Design a protein around this nucleic acid. Structure first.
Ligand SMILES: [Mg+2]
Length: 58
RNA sequence: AGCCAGGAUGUUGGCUUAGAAGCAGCCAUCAUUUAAAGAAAGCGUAAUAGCUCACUGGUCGAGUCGGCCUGCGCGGAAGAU
């Protein structure tokens, strides 16, 4: 049981560290603002901005 | 032929895609509601949407369709006294 217990904890550390490297906080806000621009009804009035957020949001 | 109705459902078949809804493709392509309606033939939408069509009903009432052999013609076909 304990080998797996440590397995989960190791993954905990790795996943939190990867959230650190990729800075999940700013991605969360940036994607949420991406979704803000996405909800913005004119989002597809400008195709360039729309597809920008398409690729960006993806 | 026109003309008038319908042109459905699961279901946007899924996946890759950013989106992909019949209609970018990949990719299956069935079953159901049936008069009949394609997991779509074209147009179209960023995507949907939307629009026709195939299919089918109803009014009209004699032809209509598109290949084969063959005769004669048409376009392709601009030059310098
Ligand atoms: Mg000739």
């Amino acid at each position: 049981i304990n080998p797996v217990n440590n397995r989960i904890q190791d993954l905990t550390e790795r996943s939190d560290v990867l959230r650190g490297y990729l800075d999940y906080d700013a991605k969360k806000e940036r994607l949420e603002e991406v979704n803000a621009e996405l909800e913005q009804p004119d989002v597809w009035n400008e195709p360039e901005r729309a597809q920008a957020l398409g690729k960006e949001r993806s």
